[PDB]
Amino acid sequence: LSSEALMRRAVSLVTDSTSTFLSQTTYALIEAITEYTKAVYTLTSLYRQYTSLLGKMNSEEEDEVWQVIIGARAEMTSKHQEYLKLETTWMTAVGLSEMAAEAAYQTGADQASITARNHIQLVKLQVEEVHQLSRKAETKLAEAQIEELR
Amino acid sequence: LSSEALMRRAVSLVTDSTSTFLSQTTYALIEAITEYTKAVYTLTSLYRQYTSLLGKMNSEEEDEVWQVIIGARAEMTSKHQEYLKLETTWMTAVGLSEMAAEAAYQTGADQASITARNHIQLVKLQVEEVHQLSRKAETKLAEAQIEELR
């Protein structure tokens, strides 16, 4: 016999699950881009308040903003403790995707090879684009620094 | 997310790495069993060709057959040892899949669970049939070598 029907209903369940997963990941990508932009803007806004507004106000607010800097730095480290695992999970995702591309090229499944190549390319584009928004904000911060210094 | 969810994500990273390793080992095992079976089949085909060319035995081809028989004894011991070691490695891979499935079931994936169950039953049938065919191949080779006396 041929296992084509077995593969057919297996991948039918897989495609239903991954269509639900694709809608869920569209929603979760909206959530993730929102959270990532909020975190980057929080970092840059606290840097801006650290650099731009020292000495204009009185002494009590000076001590207040200093304690705010200390506490917010601690809380930002605590919140950013989640981002260290994102790099490693993207590392393992990239490795697994490259393995899938190689294995599908080896087996010869053209649809699976295209799926794995576009999988690594798409995860690369998504992670590099959220990181690209972050580094665009960082580059804007550096440009504002070099223009403010000179 | 939570502490249990953080543990889930950490074990997801670990199990994705070990599942990359497990996929590599399992594909290597499948290819090794394929080479096993194809080497046995090629040796049997060469022996059948020599038997089909009977009557015109010469020094060159009979010396080749003697070398084939010596290498066939060496191959018998090597095939037995590598069958033992491949069964042991398949048991290790099954244990790795077992712990990966435990992690996934503690995660809560059900479509993955049913797909894995269907894959397990299908590959159980397939490996049972192919391993029975292989063991029968070496059993017939050993019987032919034994009855070569008469």
Binding site: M91, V94, G95 | S17
Partner: protein, 77 residues
């Protein structure tokens, strides 16, 4: 081992922080990037890592592990 208790520093101002090198746990076997990387200037031949310890110890052996993924980046000497 006394590396974790020490503080590592380099004489190259552009060198990355090397405190990751003193941990007891090595990184992933085929990590795409090494734990610590140094960029050599075209004229520079030697880079130095100076580990400082809190107190004098009877040193016996030094172990250095390169990046097993790419041995091409292993130091020559």
């Amino acid at each position: 081992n006394f590396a974790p208790l020490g503080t590592i520093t380099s004489s190259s101002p552009t060198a990355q922080p090397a405190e990751v090198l003193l941990q007891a746990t090595p990184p992933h076997r085929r990590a795409r990037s090494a734990a610590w990387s140094y960029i050599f200037l075209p004229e520079e031949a030697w880079c130095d890592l100076t580990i400082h310890l809190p107190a004098a110890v009877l040193l016996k052996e030094i172990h250095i592990q390169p990046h097993l993924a790419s041995l091409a980046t292993c130091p020559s000497s």
